């Protein structure tokens, strides 16, 4: 018997063993997230330990089958995912310290609190304390206090720890034959051994930066319009030619510009489309919302929910003594168990969240037939892009009118349409320069291109140039402002929000084209189009069994990430902004700062 056949039998034993053991961890995790006791934390942690210990044992066993002697690519995919040494390639002495810093910085971010001037007894955490100010306060100084205090009392705590974090992660990455920890993160998109569909880790940087160049015209005009409106609100603090102050961007870091809609709405006399009243009018409930979402996916050919979904899901807040984690999640426990955890209220927001999280379920159900290790999105950005495109179609006035939540004789005008796209761009487009710049800084730090004594200088140099955002207070190298965001100090990749954003609009355009949608992209609804659903299904069922380039081709007809569909979506806003900025400055000066 060959080494390839031995690996097939080994993965056969693993596939059966993993499905039972992962189910226990999923069920114990579910019981805690639906019933918060101390007993359930123990049951959740114990199952999580047994699952983690199991993977480590099978990671060692899989390494006794060298990849260079296996020809079936699908087997090589499963073995490579299981053979990942990870941070166990270090010594048991350095491994223990890395966890000590990862668990320390996580504690600092989650439990770091700041107290006001002349009020020590009172103190505010990040959530909800400081996030409330950065999202709702319209005062310059109060926002500046929260922005600076968070970065100089908690961010500085993280600065020495991040330096050690960079040294150990790089050592771990190089021992696993990667250039740096950034190269290790880019390995999610790597594809080898398939002619025409391959993809190198370095090619991700080229593709991201080439695509981001075509975003610059749209972002510059959005940035120019936002600055002009913000200048009216804050006349004495905002330059018409400079970067936007970092503490006036709607949240703590300017990751999204969503909360600037109140100050930047073009036409404040034409109300937004909020069917929340109409859902209350017809006495809808949580079951009806999810029942309507089920009908949507059936309308495009996808299957209806399993009866176990209705029986085992938690679709309403249990209220009373039973506490539950209300963040909307879609669970794939395996063995046919599919659930959604959601404290659903009867609102248009939760209505679209149901279509989103239910789209995750359809993806989960589609690749259920795959082997265990191949049950996931094509790459890190695929799964969420599938979720977002459902709320795109479900929120259009076309879809809302068809389901009797919007009056049939409803006339859409270009003013309410511009208001909607401006809201969309503040969230979807605003994050892209922020996301690319942040991961670019992390990429260069891990590469060594940025030395320790210039971390914060290069960080704010790149904020000024790429994002058009300037710090309100000069920061030396005692700060660590990137660490002030969750994803950095809690050790998560961040480029996924860039790629997924571009993926979701490639999906929507290709599906809307299959549905023969006539008109602008943003008004499209793929409902009642089985042709669009079939094209989507041909990718969902793949899971991880194929390169993500092939999976993307099965939807959009191209093998690489493309930014033109995203620009197509915002075309009515782009041409409106260019006329809106005809008397304004477009671009920014990097050497203007609010602190003179």
């Amino acid at each position: 018997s060959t080494i390839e056949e031995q690996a097939k039998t080994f993965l056969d034993k693993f596939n059966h063993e993993a499905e039972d053991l992962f189910y226990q961890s999923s069920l114990a995790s579910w019981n805690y997230n639906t019933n918060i006791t101390e007993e359930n934390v123990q049951n959740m942690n114990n199952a999580g330990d047994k699952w983690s210990a199991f993977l480590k044992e099978q990671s060692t066993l899989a390494q006794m089958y060298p990849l260079q002697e296996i020809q079936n690519l699908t087997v090589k995919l499963q073995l490579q995912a299981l053979q990942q040494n990870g941070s166990s390639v270090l010594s048991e002495d350095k491994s223990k310290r890395l966890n000590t810093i990862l668990n320390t910085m996580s504690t600092i971010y989650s439990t770091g609190k700041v107290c006001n001037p002349d009020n020590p007894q009172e103190c505010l955490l990040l959530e909800p304390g400081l996030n409330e100010i950065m999202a709702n306060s319209l005062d310059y100084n109060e926002r500046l206090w929260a922005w600076e205090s968070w970065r100089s009392e908690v961010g500085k705590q993280l600065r020495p720890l991040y330096e050690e974090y960079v040294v150990l992660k790089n050592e771990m990455a190089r021992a696993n034959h990667y250039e740096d920890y950034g190269d290790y993160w880019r390995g999610d998109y790597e594809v080898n051994g398939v002619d025409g569909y391959d993809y190198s880790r370095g090619q991700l940087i080229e593709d991201v930066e080439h695509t981001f160049e075509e975003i610059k015209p749209l972002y510059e005009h959005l940035h120019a319009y936002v600055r002009a409106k913000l200048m009216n609100a804050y006349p004495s603090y905002i330059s018409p030619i400079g970067c936007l102050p970092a503490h006036l961007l709607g949240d703590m870091w300017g990751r999204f510009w969503t909360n600037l809609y109140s100050l930047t709405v073009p036409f404040g006399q034409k109300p937004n489309i909020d069917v929340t009243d109409a859902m209350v009018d017809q006495a809808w409930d949580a079951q009806r919302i999810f029942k309507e979402a089920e009908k949507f996916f059936v309308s495009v050919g996808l299957p209806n929910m399993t009866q176990g979904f209705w029986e085992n899901s938690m679709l309403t807040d249990p209220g009373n003594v039973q506490k539950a984690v209300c963040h909307p999640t879609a669970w794939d426990l395996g063995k046919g168990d599919f659930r959604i955890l959601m404290c659903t209220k009867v609102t248009m927001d939760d209505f679209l969240t149901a279509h989103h999280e239910m789209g995750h379920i359809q993806y989960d159900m589609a690749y259920a037939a795959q082997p265990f290790l191949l049950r996931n999105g094509a790459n890190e950005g695929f799964h969420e892009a599938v979720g977002e495109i459902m709320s795109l179609s479900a929120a259009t006035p076309k879809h809302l009118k068809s389901i009797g939540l919007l009056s049939p004789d409803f006339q859409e005008d270009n003013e309410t349409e511009i208001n909607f796209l401006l809201k969309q761009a503040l969230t979807i487009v605003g994050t892209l320069p922020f996301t690319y710049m942040l991961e670019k800084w992390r990429w260069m730090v891990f590469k060594g291109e940025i030395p320790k004594d210039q971390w914060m200088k290069k960080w704010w140099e790149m904020k000024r140039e790429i994002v058009g955002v300037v710090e309100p207070v000069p920061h030396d190298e005692t700060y660590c402002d990137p660490a002030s965001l969750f994803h950095v100090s809690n050790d998560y990749s961040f480029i996924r929000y860039y790629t997924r954003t571009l993926y979701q609009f490639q999906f929507q355009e290709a599906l809307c084209q299959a549905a023969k949608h006539e008109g602008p992209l943003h008004k499209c609804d793929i409902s009642n189009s089985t042709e669009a659903g079939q094209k989507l299904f041909n990718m969902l069922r793949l899971g991880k069994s194929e390169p993500w380039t092939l999976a993307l081709e099965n939807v959009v007809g191209a093998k690489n990430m493309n930014v033109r569909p995203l620009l197509n979506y915002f075309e009515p806003l782009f041409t409106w902004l260019k006329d809106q900025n005809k008397n304004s400055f477009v671009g920014w000066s990097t050497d203007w700062s609010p602190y003179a």
Binding site: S1, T9, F10, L61, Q307, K335, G336, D337
Partner: protein, 195 residues
């Protein structure tokens, strides 16, 4: 008027595991096939070499009642000319099989919140099973080329596994009880007839 002991077969308290499937001889009795339908829409009743509507006006010899438990997706393998882990290694019907295959969901009996680990099935074997062959050996399967020496190790697997039935499982993984009747049609002195 000895009514054939189908009550023993279908309404037994516990069924056997599919790898160690049970076999019950049925002879010298009247086989009334009209009262199997006394199950919660028992999902499957498929006959081969015969037609189910005529069943309770025929006469057969060599009647055997086989019974075990599998999951929903594996029910499709209890049929002539099928392969898969159940057909290959646990219970195999011949190509020219003459009989009836009866199966129904038993989630309310064979499932457990903490998991039902009563029922087993065989995962590895040297070769496929001949029709109606039974193998209950616990010998360690050798997947490599060094001898396993009767010990579970690397490339050395215990041949059996458990079904781990939980009621929250999907239909495909929920337990299904199966009864497979085997008879020879219109032969010899005709021990089992029924109405």
């Amino acid at each position: 008027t000895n009514l054939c002991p189908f009550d023993e077969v279908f309404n037994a308290t516990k069924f056997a595991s599919v790898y160690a499937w049970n076999r019950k001889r049925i002879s010298n009795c009247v086989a009334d096939y009209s009262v199997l339908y006394n199950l919660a829409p028992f999902f499957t009743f498929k006959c081969y070499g015969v037609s189910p509507t005529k069943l309770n006006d025929l006469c057969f010899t060599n009647v055997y009642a086989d019974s075990f438990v599998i999951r929903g997706d594996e029910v499709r393998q209890i049929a002539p000319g099928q392969t898969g882990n159940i057909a290959d290694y646990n219970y195999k019907l011949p190509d020219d099989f003459t009989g009836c295959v009866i199966a129904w969901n038993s989630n309310k009996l064979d499932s457990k919140v903490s998991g039902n680990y009563n029922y087993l099935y065989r995962l590895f074997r040297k070769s496929n099973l001949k029709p109606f062959e039974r193998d209950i050996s616990t010998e360690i399967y050798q997947a490599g080329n060094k001898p396993c020496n009767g010990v579970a190790g690397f490339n050395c697997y215990f041949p059996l596994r458990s079904y781990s039935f939980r009621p929250t499982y999907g239909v495909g993984h929920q337990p299904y009880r199966v009864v497979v009747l085997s008879f020879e049609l219109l032969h010899a002195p005709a021990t089992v007839c029924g109405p």
